[PDB]
Design a protein around this ligand. Sequence first.
Ligand SMILES: *CC[C@H]1/C(=C/c2[nH]c(/C=C3N=C(/C=C4\NC(=O)C(CC)=C4C)C(C)=C\3CCC(=O)O)c(CCC(=O)O)c2C)NC(=O)[C@@H]1C
Ligand SMILES: *[C@H](C)[C@H]1/C(=C/c2[nH]c(/C=C3N=C(/C=C4\NC(=O)C(CC)=C4C)C(C)=C\3CCC(=O)O)c(CCC(=O)O)c2C)NC(=O)[C@@H]1C
Ligand SMILES: C=CC1=C(C)[C@@H](Cc2[nH]c(/C=C3N=C(/C=C4\NC(=O)[C@H](C)[C@H]4CC)C(C)=C\3CCC(=O)O)c(CCC(=O)O)c2C)NC1=O
Ligand SMILES: CCC1=C(C)/C(=C/C2=NC(=C/c3[nH]c(/C=C4/NC(=O)[C@H](C)[C@H]4CC)c(C)c3CCC(=O)O)/C(CCC(=O)O)=C2C)NC1=O
Ligand SMILES: CCC1=C(C)/C(=C/C2=NC(=C\c3[nH]c(/C=C4\NC(=O)[C@H](C)[C@H]4CC)c(C)c3CCC(=O)O)/C(CCC(=O)O)=C2C)NC1=O
Ligand SMILES: CCC1=C(C)/C(=C/C2=NC(=C\c3[nH]c(/C=C4\NC(=O)[C@H](C)[C@H]4CC)c(C)c3CCC(=O)O)/C(CCC(=O)O)=C2C)NC1=O
Ligand SMILES: CCC1=C(C)/C(=C/C2=NC(=C\c3[nH]c(/C=C4\NC(=O)[C@H](C)[C@H]4CC)c(C)c3CCC(=O)O)/C(CCC(=O)O)=C2C)NC1=O
Ligand SMILES: CCC1=C(C)/C(=C/C2=NC(=C\c3[nH]c(/C=C4\NC(=O)[C@H](C)[C@H]4CC)c(C)c3CCC(=O)O)/C(CCC(=O)O)=C2C)NC1=O
Ligand SMILES: CCC1=C(C)/C(=C/C2=NC(=C\c3[nH]c(/C=C4\NC(=O)[C@H](C)[C@H]4CC)c(C)c3CCC(=O)O)/C(CCC(=O)O)=C2C)NC1=O
Ligand SMILES: CCC1=C(C)/C(=C/C2=NC(=C\c3[nH]c(/C=C4\NC(=O)[C@H](C)[C@H]4CC)c(C)c3CCC(=O)O)/C(CCC(=O)O)=C2C)NC1=O
Ligand SMILES: CCC1=C(C)/C(=C/C2=NC(=C\c3[nH]c(/C=C4\NC(=O)[C@H](C)[C@H]4CC)c(C)c3CCC(=O)O)/C(CCC(=O)O)=C2C)NC1=O
Lengths: 54, 92, 98, 172, 162, 161, 161, 161, 160, 160, 146
Amino acid sequence: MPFNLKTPRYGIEFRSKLAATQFSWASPIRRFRPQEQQPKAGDPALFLNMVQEM
Amino acid sequence: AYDMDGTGAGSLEPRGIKSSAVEKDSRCFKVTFVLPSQSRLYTFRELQNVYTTKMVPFSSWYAEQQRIQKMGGKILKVELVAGGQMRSVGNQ
Amino acid sequence: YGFSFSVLESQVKNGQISIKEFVRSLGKSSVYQKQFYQPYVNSRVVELAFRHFLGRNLSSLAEFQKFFAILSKKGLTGLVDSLINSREYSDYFNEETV
Amino acid sequence: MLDAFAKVVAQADARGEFLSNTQIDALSKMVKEGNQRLDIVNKVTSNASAIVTNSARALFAEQPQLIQPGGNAYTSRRMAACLRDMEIVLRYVSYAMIAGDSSVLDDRCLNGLRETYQALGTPGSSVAVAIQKMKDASVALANDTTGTPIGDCSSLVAELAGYFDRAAVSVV
Amino acid sequence: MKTPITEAIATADNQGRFLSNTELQAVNGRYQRATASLTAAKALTGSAQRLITGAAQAVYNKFPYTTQMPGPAYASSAIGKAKCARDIGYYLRMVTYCLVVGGTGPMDEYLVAGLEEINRSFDLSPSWYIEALQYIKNSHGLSGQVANEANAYIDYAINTLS
Amino acid sequence: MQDAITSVINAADVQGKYLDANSVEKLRGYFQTGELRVRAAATIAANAATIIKEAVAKSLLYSDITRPGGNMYTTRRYAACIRDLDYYLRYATYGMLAGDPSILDERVLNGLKETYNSLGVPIGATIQAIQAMKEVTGSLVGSDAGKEMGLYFDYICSGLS
Amino acid sequence: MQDAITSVINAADVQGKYLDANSVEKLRGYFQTGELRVRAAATIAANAATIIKEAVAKSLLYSDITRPGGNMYTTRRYAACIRDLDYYLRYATYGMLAGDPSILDERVLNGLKETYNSLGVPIGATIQAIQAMKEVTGSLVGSDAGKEMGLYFDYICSGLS
Amino acid sequence: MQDAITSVINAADVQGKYLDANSVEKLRGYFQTGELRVRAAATIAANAATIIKEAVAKSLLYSDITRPGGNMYTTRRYAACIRDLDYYLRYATYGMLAGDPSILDERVLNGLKETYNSLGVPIGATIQAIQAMKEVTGSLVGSDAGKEMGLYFDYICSGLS
Amino acid sequence: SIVTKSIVNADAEARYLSPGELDRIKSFVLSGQRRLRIAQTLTENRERIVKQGGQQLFQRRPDVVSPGGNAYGEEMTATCLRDLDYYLRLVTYGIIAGDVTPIEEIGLVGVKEMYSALGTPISGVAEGIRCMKDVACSLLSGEDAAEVGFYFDYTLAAMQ
Amino acid sequence: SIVTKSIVNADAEARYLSPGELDRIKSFVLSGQRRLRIAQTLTENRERIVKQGGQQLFQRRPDVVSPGGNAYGEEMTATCLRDLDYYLRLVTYGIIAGDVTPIEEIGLVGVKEMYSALGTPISGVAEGIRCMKDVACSLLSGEDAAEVGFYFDYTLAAMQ
Amino acid sequence: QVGNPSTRSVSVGSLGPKVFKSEGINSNAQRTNNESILQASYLAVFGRMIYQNERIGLKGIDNKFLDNNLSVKELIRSLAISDTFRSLYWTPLYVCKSIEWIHYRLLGRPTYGRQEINQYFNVAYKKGFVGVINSIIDSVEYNECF
Ligand SMILES: *CC[C@H]1/C(=C/c2[nH]c(/C=C3N=C(/C=C4\NC(=O)C(CC)=C4C)C(C)=C\3CCC(=O)O)c(CCC(=O)O)c2C)NC(=O)[C@@H]1C
Ligand SMILES: *[C@H](C)[C@H]1/C(=C/c2[nH]c(/C=C3N=C(/C=C4\NC(=O)C(CC)=C4C)C(C)=C\3CCC(=O)O)c(CCC(=O)O)c2C)NC(=O)[C@@H]1C
Ligand SMILES: C=CC1=C(C)[C@@H](Cc2[nH]c(/C=C3N=C(/C=C4\NC(=O)[C@H](C)[C@H]4CC)C(C)=C\3CCC(=O)O)c(CCC(=O)O)c2C)NC1=O
Ligand SMILES: CCC1=C(C)/C(=C/C2=NC(=C/c3[nH]c(/C=C4/NC(=O)[C@H](C)[C@H]4CC)c(C)c3CCC(=O)O)/C(CCC(=O)O)=C2C)NC1=O
Ligand SMILES: CCC1=C(C)/C(=C/C2=NC(=C\c3[nH]c(/C=C4\NC(=O)[C@H](C)[C@H]4CC)c(C)c3CCC(=O)O)/C(CCC(=O)O)=C2C)NC1=O
Ligand SMILES: CCC1=C(C)/C(=C/C2=NC(=C\c3[nH]c(/C=C4\NC(=O)[C@H](C)[C@H]4CC)c(C)c3CCC(=O)O)/C(CCC(=O)O)=C2C)NC1=O
Ligand SMILES: CCC1=C(C)/C(=C/C2=NC(=C\c3[nH]c(/C=C4\NC(=O)[C@H](C)[C@H]4CC)c(C)c3CCC(=O)O)/C(CCC(=O)O)=C2C)NC1=O
Ligand SMILES: CCC1=C(C)/C(=C/C2=NC(=C\c3[nH]c(/C=C4\NC(=O)[C@H](C)[C@H]4CC)c(C)c3CCC(=O)O)/C(CCC(=O)O)=C2C)NC1=O
Ligand SMILES: CCC1=C(C)/C(=C/C2=NC(=C\c3[nH]c(/C=C4\NC(=O)[C@H](C)[C@H]4CC)c(C)c3CCC(=O)O)/C(CCC(=O)O)=C2C)NC1=O
Ligand SMILES: CCC1=C(C)/C(=C/C2=NC(=C\c3[nH]c(/C=C4\NC(=O)[C@H](C)[C@H]4CC)c(C)c3CCC(=O)O)/C(CCC(=O)O)=C2C)NC1=O
Ligand SMILES: CCC1=C(C)/C(=C/C2=NC(=C\c3[nH]c(/C=C4\NC(=O)[C@H](C)[C@H]4CC)c(C)c3CCC(=O)O)/C(CCC(=O)O)=C2C)NC1=O
């Protein structure tokens, strides 16, 4: 890993302690994936990323 | 569904009290009575209040009034608090 | 599950209806027949009703045939009315004891 | 780092055989498309600073809370860092277009980019929104038939679209 | 139905006369060309689902807003993606009908008569179908006069939409 | 209970007569305004929680009843307060549908004045709370529907005083 | 109990899916026949006493079970037995309206075979009375609704053997 | 078991009658269509492994019934399911040849709904596979034999429902 | 379903259905074409109705997604929108069933006990359903938007 | 386990476990900690074992992935590696159980009937399991690959 | 058999099931149904056809029968005392539910009462699973009927 992508400007231990004054953002909405389209154990759709690396 | 479907003597269902209430009747009285136990001196259950004033549906007043009389009780007052008098339809 | 019979409770807390009248309108309710009338046959409904409105089991064969015939002819409310309007209920429970 | 030819050499180097004469025809088909490759890259590297700022402006109208006071990309210190962060993704996507394979995209850019947005608290789903804003601007500019002969280039813009939605699923 | 056979009958019947050699020569040219036309009709039929599913994808990669916008006119849900691939299979089925018949007769009545009233009413854009028809032209994989007979009825559809 | 349809069947049956012209006219008066009640009945059932929340805060929220010692003090009192207001709102909606206030005398006003006097509930405040519930409910169903709705709110307050 | 509509909803909800095209066609199959079932249900309720009266005369009236020694000899056993036939007719009508034999499992068939074995009632003669009652019903309601009613008459007999 | 000829001989024996015109009509009805049954029975025996392989993939191949946790997940459970479909197809051909579904009652359907309810086999998914097996076989044997073959696939699902 | 409640109600009395009860079944099967079409229009607008509904909910209730709220985080907000999809799916079942009994038997019986145990504010789930009602009611006509809104307001009343 | 077959073998004879029969059970539990380490190695290398085993299976049998083969396509090829993931899991079960019964009872009984009914070449599935064996025996020591080699070998012989 | 104890072996006819007999009738006395009596034996013991993986262990038994080296009694016995039969109908069952089932397969009827079910339950307590099979196949009702 490159070191600028290893150690950023601040870590998880400085960000989590200031969630009252600073770093209060709450996160926007993700793209809505329906729950019944998600793969379960024994589905061949969990190996399509393996097949595209062939 | 109602107690007056023709069941009388010589039928398969045992003889009981028959009411003149319609299906899902909604008339209720307001009664007052005293009903002693007359059996506590050989069962020895706890003592209970026997002076009662309660609202009883029209569908059960013939059986309740007939039960209070068999068991020595005395009915002190009865009034109709819900429902119309001599109404043809609209008792449901 | 958060069920509630709100008009029945205020009438029984105030004294307008007794506990016998509270139990009777809980038998002919919709929550009761949804749970103890629909998923069962008429034979099993007569036996479970004796456990809820009388606190005991059927004793004889002529006692089943008398109450099976009432349920078969008048449904749920014709059965629950015949159990609370009986002398055995008032003997053990007189208008105020659950 | 590999190019497209290096992944065919280093694959059969591990098998240890000579490169077959039917594999040379796949490498010679690539150099026939070698000059249609070079003006997909020239179309996107020349409008590079307007693919970025027109996609950020479309992002900040959909999700206005990223730039409002108390938001992540609020101040002028951090608007500039958000604007830089899409310039770096567009840089390495065009690097993996000119090489033919994505081995420099997921090595110096995507190698742990997800784990530093959990440490910074940056919403990683919103960076993958603004990458698909840049994908829609870059495949529309690679269909530009000005200063170029007309031909079918649909298989190479579908490869440029592949490196855009690889860098979007690697931050979420 | 514009067929070479029925354009010959209607030419002789405009003036109330029998079929001369002006008309038997016109339907001779249908039969010489029918060999190349009937081999394109089997090749476009046998690779239909490869061409329909490939050309529906060609519109989404060219117009990405059609899979993102909300509304009944766009292919953002599964209902709109099924009505899109239904239309591409309508355009491919009309082209094989014209190669069987010989002229631009089936897609005149069944496809293009009244089409621009439909695209204006239901807010459908005709540039989506030009992009889909230009995928089928570049990917039927035919050659020779078999390809020239197929490309002519594809280009006839592109000129009606433009 | 008897609605507008049953009330005209009753008047005819006590004479042994069929439904004559004066009877069929009253029946059209109900049918013509029927789908307007069904629309107003669904609008109040959807805004039932807010019709009571704004009536209570506007009528009796910071008064002496909510203070210690006053009536409606404990949470049991408060929950019994707003449980009563929903009873009136739910039964006045039954009367507007049937077009006859007979259901209010059997299941609401059945000796309710004696019960409130024994318990010590302020009758003057409950009548003004129902009145405040009539001015917010009228804003929803309009005047033409608000005319029928208010016809029964005054029936409860008049049968309560 | 669950009808043909709720049976489709539960099949989809148990997977977490919305109603797709395969389930929408089952929903259309029930709506198209809804007016045919309501029409047969009204004619069966009016001819119930004559369906039972003619299925009994045709199957078990002058048989051995009506004489001394057989099952249903005394008048209580004749009256208790045609009360059973009035169960099957009424519950076969509920199943025809709902288009699902679910109500026959819960409220009719669950534990009905053991009841007859303890009482001593012949199952073979009961199945013949329901089959004779299926033929009389099929002539009153027609040939289309008549074979729907027979669909739930056979569920009782096969659920009883 | 009794075939179509035996069912006609027994129906006349129970009456004490020589074979009349009505029973001779039912005898010819079987003799005429008899060679159409020997052809369908010979084509089903040849495409047996194909009719099952196409109804499985059509109905229950990529569902959650084959994934881990589903009834029929492991290879023992998979091989046990396609062995059940082999009996239904094989027994619906015995019934089509004999022209009488008596073979299905005595050897297939007796206590079969109690057997699946004990093991946990889904009855709904089993009926779908037989419905899929009904149309895949109806395309091979034609329109005449395809309808009589479906007569005994429906007899199995009806008693299994 | 409308048919189910008519059959169980006439079983408690041990009798057949009356003409007034059978006409409610005829009147209901006649509207089957309109119900199957309204449910289809909502099923085709899942991502917009669910996404639009949860977007407005976080402006009327910004605390639920801020630091400390129940739905704080991307994975929590994802399950946040998962719940709204449950009730949209249940609403399509009620529109097709002809009554609100599927919405009750699935996700309204014991709803206050479930959400109090998970630590979720039940008042926020009812605010999120009221926002989905405005989005879903803007895709329909004058008459179809009126009845579809009644199925959304019923869920909110039973959720308070 | 050997415990299960030792009790079923002694239960049928209606007697208690034998003296030597008990010594086998004691020797099994003393090696249980070592069995957990071998099975732990394959569990964290599962995707690499399936990939390399998947690649080298398509070079020794290109007919399975060519036009006309069973695993032709990217979705049908995904079902290839899915089945390879199953059997790699079942061999980890047999390593911890010290026996082949977890493999045999899960995916060995009815394996000929199952693959014969799918149209899948049973001859090729054994080839893929043999290609997964060398990778698994490549990540283990001299005698650890001799332990895992028993379970990989039993699966192939039963698949022919 | 309770009002006619001597009716044992006398074939019922077309009212009963099909009876398979290793006959060997010919002008040279050759058995031509060795492959049908073996198929009928698996269906009598197991009721179905076992899987190809579990039938592998029994191939040594089928090879000796098809070679005309085993009787039907020694074939039925060698199938019932196998470990695939034991793993199906003895181990996963209540001990008296296995005797009631195993008795119904080897002999065509269920037990008469307690004097017959207690007799085998004592043979199982002492000898085991194999002792129960041999006591039914060496029975007197078996040799008289089959
Ligand atoms: C519109 C963009 C979203 C956003 C971005 C944002 N990012 C940062 C900070 C960093 N991003 C990286 C990632 C890389 N840096 C690199 O140099 C490379 C190539 C080697 C990568 C892949 C790193 C290290 C940082 C930290 C500083 C930096 O180098 O840029 C910030 C600033 C963080 C701060 O609080 O100062 C922002 C605002 N944030 C959003 O709101 C948008 C969704
Ligand atoms: C897919 C490429 C794009 C797309 C398709 C889309 N089309 C429709 C609706 C219609 N399409 C037609 C076209 C024909 N009907 C015919 O019979 C023939 C000849 C055989 C043709 C060419 C018509 C008439 C309609 C409207 C009526 C109908 O729905 O059948 C829709 C639905 C639009 C609506 O409002 O219902 C869609 C989504 N849309 C895209 O975005 C794709 C890029
Ligand atoms: C260093 C700078 C540099 C470039 C910019 C390119 C520029 C470039 N492209 C082409 C040649 C070409 N360029 C294109 C490209 C396109 N046609 C389209 O419709 C698309 C819009 C577009 C790319 C996406 C095509 C299709 C050809 C080949 C013509 C053909 O085969 O039909 C040629 C001619 C080559 C020859 O004659 O053999 C040149 C010089 N090459 C370079 O070395
Ligand atoms: C002892 C039994 C008893 C209780 C408990 C009681 C409660 C009661 N609490 C109120 C609460 C209230 N409580 C708060 C409390 C808050 N807490 C916080 O942590 C937030 C910062 C804030 C918002 C929730 C607020 C703001 C109100 C007034 C609401 C309003 O009128 O807008 C009011 C309305 C005004 C009034 O006081 O009359 C009553 C009657 N009454 C009683 O007899
Ligand atoms: C054994 C002692 C005893 C008696 C007598 C008794 C009577 C009694 N009669 C009743 C009603 C009634 N009684 C009558 C009777 C009559 N109408 C006429 O015109 C007549 C002159 C009269 C017939 C002789 C009618 C019509 C009603 C119904 C009233 C109504 O529905 O409005 C009711 C109300 C409940 C019900 O009807 O089911 C009771 C309790 N209860 C008892 O415990
Ligand atoms: C369906 C028709 C119907 C009504 C209306 C009804 C009323 C009724 N209101 C009650 C109490 C009450 N009602 C209130 C009401 C109020 N306090 C105020 O300040 C306001 C003026 C008013 C709001 C309307 C309060 C505070 C109590 C509790 C009294 C106590 O617990 O002592 C009680 C006693 C039972 C209980 O404690 O819940 C009944 C029975 N019952 C019925 O069956
Ligand atoms: C021990 C108690 C007991 C009784 C009473 C009884 C009656 C009884 N009466 C019957 C028929 C009958 N009963 C009658 C009787 C009459 N017709 C008239 O006009 C007169 C009013 C009346 C006689 C005085 C008739 C005509 C039939 C034949 C009806 C038919 O076949 O449709 C039948 C049907 C066939 C049969 O006889 O088995 C039974 C079972 N069964 C019993 O177990
Ligand atoms: C809702 C589903 C349901 C059914 C059907 C049901 C039936 C039922 N039938 C009964 C009796 C009976 N059922 C019959 C019926 C018959 N006799 C015959 O010969 C015919 C074959 C048959 C008429 C078709 C007879 C005669 C008795 C009385 C048995 C006795 O008194 O010993 C009894 C015992 C009660 C009594 O003796 O009255 C029950 C509980 N229970 C249920 O819960
Ligand atoms: C745990 C024990 C166990 C196993 C092993 C198992 C296998 C199993 N393998 C399947 C398919 C399959 N397997 C393959 C495999 C291959 N194609 C080839 O050419 C190669 C020879 C081979 C890969 C090495 C293919 C192509 C399918 C899908 C066939 C079809 O869909 O028609 C399926 C059908 C769909 C699904 O995956 O659910 C099941 C159930 N199930 C189990 O419970
Ligand atoms: C069909 C009827 C039905 C419902 C409704 C249902 C809800 C349900 N909501 C859950 C969690 C949750 N629900 C929420 C909900 C919310 N957060 C907010 O800010 C909003 C106010 C609110 C609504 C969007 C959150 C954040 C979680 C995850 C809680 C956690 O992970 O700590 C969970 C636990 C995880 C899961 O299995 O998904 C269930 C079971 N289950 C059901 O069967
Ligand atoms: C493997 C599981 C299993 C068990 C346990 C089992 C027991 C069993 N115990 C029996 C009898 C018996 N069991 C007892 C037992 C007892 N008497 C007492 O006082 C004690 C409290 C108790 C023993 C501790 C007696 C006295 C009998 C004889 C009953 C009789 O002869 O009527 C019988 C009937 C024997 C026969 O009729 O041939 C069986 C089958 N069967 C099984 O399949």
